[PDB]
Amino acid sequence: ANPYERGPDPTESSIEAVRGPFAVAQTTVSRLQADGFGGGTIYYPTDTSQGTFGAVAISPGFTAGQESIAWLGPRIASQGFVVITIDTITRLDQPDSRGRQLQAALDHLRTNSVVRNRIDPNRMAVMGHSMGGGGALSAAANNTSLEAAIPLQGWHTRKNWSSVRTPTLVVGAQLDTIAPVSSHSEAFYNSLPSDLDKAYMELRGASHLVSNTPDTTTAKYSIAWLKRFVDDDLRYEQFLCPAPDDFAISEYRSTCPF
Amino acid sequence: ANPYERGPDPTESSIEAVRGPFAVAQTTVSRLQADGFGGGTIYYPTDTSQGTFGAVAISPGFTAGQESIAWLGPRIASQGFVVITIDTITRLDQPDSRGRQLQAALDHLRTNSVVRNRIDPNRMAVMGHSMGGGGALSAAANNTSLEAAIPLQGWHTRKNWSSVRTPTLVVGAQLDTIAPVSSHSEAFYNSLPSDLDKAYMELRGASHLVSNTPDTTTAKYSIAWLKRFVDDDLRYEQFLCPAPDDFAISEYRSTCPF
């Protein structure tokens, strides 16, 4: 019935895995080949027999490069997504610009010879860390057809996200001193529409740097969110609704059921 | 002849390598087993045939976990060091405490069953990021027998380090707005004794978090510094005196020649 479902029925184990059920490969987009962003690495499932996949673009924060978010690329792609980790046009680009560059990176995928025939360009999502997470929110606020947005310890001067229409998972780090949850993450959750499919997940005892090295909690709920909303995969609702019984989470709020 | 020399003569490539010439293994110190720190991972060369190695302890910064500085552990150990990356007793510990914990971690190596016969207990060093780098300075200020100290984007309320007697490499980030180099890194360099072997290296265009993700400049000059001063290895002077030409370095000062 759902033509976008990919992979076997999930379990806690399967969404926690460093590599999911899809073998992955990668290809590089040079800065020269990139129109509207600074280049990137595309991670993709090598299996073409299950249909095309949704696409996800991921942005780093201020002065940072792909390497600060790279581990997310193959970890998410191996669950059945085409994922591009981007560099920005300059190191100093601000959040709204990072959002336009995330959208440019997603749109580049339909022109890339390696992956253009592996994607469904109508099912795309945005993620990012700190200013890159502010970029994810801006990208969603500037494209109401995006299927999902995931700011990781997002930073933005804009606190009012009432125009977002894209299901959004706001991942905060409890002890963040750079993008403190009280003035960034939680403020974003509060201003997103009250009837939008949305969640706030706070990582217990976590610093701002939690997304820059492998974090199983970040990965598993990012994967469940992308499944639920890029693929409309109801098999993953169980992991998102209601609050998970998870010691790694210090706080949770959502508009469940979705 | 210098009995502490380990490995072949270096090149720029050899100090930039993600893994040096020594195969490494690891062992874990749990939080329960750790006296005076929060546990850690010890990375060590498995080849004992060239002699014992100097030891290095590395601390994360405020609110952060061991994983945020873990990349340094095997990258440095594979050049011929026993390296312990620590967690702190609580995530909110301040710099002076981080220094006492770095010292406790070094002292733990002296009786650790896996590495006691692999270390030279008289040749030890400290490093850390931000408050952990302030911790490295504090540890040196309370133990003048330490052979090297390397604060990475260090933060401390104490600005005067005139009683430090340990050769120190201060790695600042040009665009740091959290531990700005003018009031932190550069102040530390300036107050270290004028006749100490010391250097200041500023990373061009970099934020406060630059050394928390693999950064070739951070790695290569940390390795050269630890070689030069933990091992007294004059083969590594060439990389430190005079200023390296790297585009990634926006400022350099030192007391060369050492």
What does this entry look like structurally?
The structure is a homodimer of 258-residue chains. The first copy, chain A, is α/β, with parallel strands linked by helices and 258 residues long. Chain A has one domain (1-258). Helices cover 22% and strands 22% of the residues of chain A. Chain A is built from six helices and nine strands. Chain A has helices at residues 12-16, 72-77, 95-108, 131-141, 185-191, 216-230, and strands at residues 24-29, 40-45, 53-59, 82-86, 119-129, 148-152, 168-173, 198-203, 249-254. A nine-stranded mixed β-sheet of chain A has the order 1-2-4-3-5-6-7-8-9, with helices on both faces. In chain A, strand 5 (119-129), helix 4 (131-141) and strand 6 (148-152) form a beta-alpha-beta unit. The relative contact order of chain A is 0.15. The interface between A and B is medium-sized, with 22 and 22 residues.
Short description:
The structure is a homodimer of 258-residue chains. The first copy, chain A, is α/β, with parallel strands linked by helices and 258 residues long.
Work out the largest interface and the residue count of each chain: A-B, 22 and 22 residues
Taken together, the total number of domains of chain A comes to 1
User: Could you give the order of the helices and strands of chain A?
Assistant: HEEEHEHEHEEHEHE
Helix content of chain A: 10-25%
Biggest sheet architecture of chain A: 9 strands, mixed
How many distinct beta strands of chain A?
A: 9
Round the Cα radius of gyration of chain A to an integer and report it: 16 Å
Strand order of the largest sheet of chain A: 1-2-4-3-5-6-7-8-9
Count of alpha/pi helices of chain A:
6
